């Protein structure tokens, strides 16, 4: 059903300001769970994505947006069609293919060494969920094709963490060897946004957290004294931590850094085969993630 | 006056359950700025206190008590007779030399190798802010009644946590080597007093602190946003670094030493010439310290 | 030549002392990038191998080796054979799939609740750079012989840092729910040895990390005295932590992590256009990938 | 015979190529341990020094050097005649007070803030082993003859080490506050001789605390593996150390902090009532403080 998912959505077509966008026609790919459709904005043809409705375990899904109509190349990229396509993939597909070609701000973006998730079209992927970043710029005659940016959506919270921390480092790597002011100001623009998703993030990791220690200490009564303890100040450490996110405080990953070492230390210790021990450690575990990328 | 201050209170008294103490007469000694008490306890001959005002800056001032009365040994060692005249004592001396012949509990504790500090003799120094200790066993040729306890105020909050860190040593090492259970009690519950004191030190140090910024973030109009932040976020490290001391965590001096190194930023940054701002600073100062020793 | 190299070296044979592992007959798979190899050991039939070579950059290359003769079942597995085999694919796949059903060791192991790394056939795959492990028991409906062991090499050395460390956690956790001595002495074992080929991995990139700046020092004349105080120290501090790789102390580690730290700094700074600093360079870089892992 | 010792050196004279220093005119002091000495510079007066021979133990041996004549000024100090006069007393005193009134380089660098110790006059007392230091600048009606340095030979090990360390950071203080070129060179080129001092300290204290640790491991059988392994790994951990100082190298601090941290490590684990590990502890207790002033 996963493909006629697609083919009815499509078929239907995705309306915008800026026109809707048809299916044109489609096509059998390279394998038997390989597609090719082919949309148009409007009248005008738009762009192919070549998509994959996958095959578990050994095969993941995934779609690639390509051929991009050069004529439509200042009026697609940066619009509501371009955001609503992708509002729609990323529905279906966790991992992305999209030729920035096309794009003159993405393409002299990453010449200039931004990060891909801090590209404009990268930031757009971002948005969505899409965590991990890979710039195919090296084609050299080695692999066909390679002028695409590579998007995926974490595996897990741990993941989506690692992802974050690591995205933290490009971002500041590049501020420090860049020399635009212009450009700067729209990576930290964009970068900005992103730290906005993560504070929230821990403040309702915290909560899910204090919540779940409060109910261990509190009906769990055979326990540790050092059990209680250490479910006890977590639950505090948290409370301060998200105290200063709720004021978005500079001090802030000081302190969820210190909170992030005794949630660890909380899980670990208190952890079990009790259904309350299970959501604790884990509740825990899901706040430790969250301060990474702090 | 210094001397005058001394003379009023020995001439009215210092009275206790056990009786009160009077001065019966005082005499020149070897030198000028050396003086000889006589002290009564009740209508009974108690002990002589050897004085010594200080000549700054060569000469530190102190106070040697001895000649104590082998009949009332039994009955002023650990009496609040014994305790109000210390109490009187630290007052006006940082360094003072405590005869321990007349004392069989100190002197058996001394004996079975306890450090001075922990001794029933020494303890009660020890709760009045004296942190460096000296045993004499031997009266070293020229020292008359070589059988004194000396004692001395730390010099800095560096002094003072560096005495505090050798005691937290030779207590250890005594834990280890004695076979009196007994004994180790008493020490152990001596000890554990010693944490109490500075930790309820710093529980008072904390909220005399979270006040000042409290205040200050409040009433001060005329500040920063950035100094809205520092008082800000600084009033809840304190919170939860003193909510951890109230319950006596393990984790607490963790806490203890973040919200010190954001009270110092607080107070350098929101130091002024307002009597909010010179009280603000203060206090932070004030916990900052009280944390030193942990 | 991908494909071809691995049909020229299975049709030549790969001999061991259990008998010569021979090309029976090889079949196009499901895909066009699939194929299916029979194998025979001596002249009996031993198993199939279903290869993916890969398509960049969405399809990962892997192996799947299945269909093991269940009569040879006590011959190969554990032997020379398997241990040559893997060997030979490790070469060519990053990704490698194994059935473990007609291996009663491994199978007892991991209902045991055994890590899958340090199960008796993981543990061979370990052996050889596969970091990331996956046990299927669920042929989670659209894969057949839902009983295989799935293993990865690490994408980078943070990823192999990260595995290494997530392995060390289910390591312990296990010997904390194992009853049988047995048991937890072969894991051991096995954990020990793991230990002992990173330690081997250290000494020896720190020694050809000693003889890089060895070289340069001594040999490129050109240099500033501060690029001779880079290299010469770096060379006694990868000496030190050599001594205590050697000796296989538990003070080794901090000694790595403090190499480590101007070792790069070497490589930073005395990196150049000649071969004595671009091997220089280069094997301290090397060491301090070596140092991760601890 | 202490004060014969002094009398007789002070009428045998002191020589020097700016004039011999003789004593004038010997009196009697405040107390019965106290003298007055009056000394000249070939035939005009030079200054007065007031001794306290000291009184064991409540009271410590003192030197103050005063009065000393203005016209003299500008030959007296910074002349080998000053040298020759402090060689002397550092020989009889640990404590020492000196008048810098008439001293417009010392009283100016005071005045610009420069630490006490590295003070034209004060450096000269740093050499001679004088650790500690105060600067009297106070008077204001509270204590009578304000204007004094007062240095003083170090208690222990620990205290010397404890000293220097304090001034490095008096040190570096004052240097990034400083806006006098001419200033901050002389106190650097002081410095830096200190410097020189403190690292050839580390070179022995690493030797004696090697050589300690070897004795131990060698003859002392009944020990445990934990222990061979504790004392092995500090004699080289030493050895690396000691290395960097013989070249005085910039990363040397970094060794010895690592090096101080097993050495103490040592120290603690190995130390027992055998005379081997009495004098192994204790090497390796000296070399630990070698390196805080690092």
Redesign the interface.
Same mark, same amino acid.
């Given at each position: 059903v996963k493909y006629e998912e697609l083919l009815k959505t499509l078929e239907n077509g995705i309306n915008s300001e800026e026109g809707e966008i048809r299916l044109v026609r489609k096509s059998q790919g $390279?394998?038997?769970e390989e597609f090719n459709f082919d949309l148009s904005l409007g009248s005008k043809p738009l762009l192919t994505l070549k998509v994959?409705l996958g095959? +578990? %375990?050994? !095969?993941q899904p995934?779609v690639?947006v390509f051929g991009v109509n050069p004529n439509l190349r200042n009026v697609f990229f940066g619009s509501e069609a371009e955001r609503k396509l992708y509002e729609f993939l990323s529905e279906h597909f966790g $991992?992305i293919?999209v030729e920035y070609f096309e794009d003159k701000e993405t393409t002299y973006e990453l010449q200039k060494g931004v990060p891909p998730a801090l590209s404009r079209l990268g930031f757009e992927l971002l948005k969505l969920g899409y965590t991990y970043f $890979?710039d !195919?710029f090296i084609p050299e005659g080695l692999?066909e094709g390679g002028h +695409?940016i /590579?998007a995926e959506k974490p595996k897990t919270a741990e993941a989506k963490a690692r992802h974050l921390a690591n995205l933290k480092k490009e971002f500041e790597e590049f501020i420090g060897k860049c020399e635009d002011e212009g450009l700067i100001k729209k990576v930290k623009e964009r970068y900005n946004f992103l730290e906005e998703e993560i504070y929230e993030r821990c403040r309702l990791a915290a909560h899910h957290c204090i919540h779940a220690c409060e109910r261990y200490l509190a009906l769990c009564t055979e326990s540790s004294r050092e059990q209680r /303890?250490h479910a006890?100040?977590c639950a505090? &450490?948290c $409370? *301060?931590a998200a &105290? &200063?996110l709720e004021?978005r405080? %500079? !001090?802030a990953p =000081? =302190?969820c850094e *210190?909170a992030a070492r005794?949630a660890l230390a909380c899980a670990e210790r208190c952890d079990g085969d009790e259904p309350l021990e299970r959501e604790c450690a884990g509740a825990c575990r899901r706040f430790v993630a969250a301060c990474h990328p702090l």
């Open positions: $390279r394998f038997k994959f095959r +578990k %375990p050994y !095969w995934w690639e $991992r293919f $890979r !195919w692999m +695409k /590579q /303890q006890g100040d505090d &450490l $409370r *301060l &105290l &200063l004021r405080s %500079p !001090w =000081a =302190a *210190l005794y």
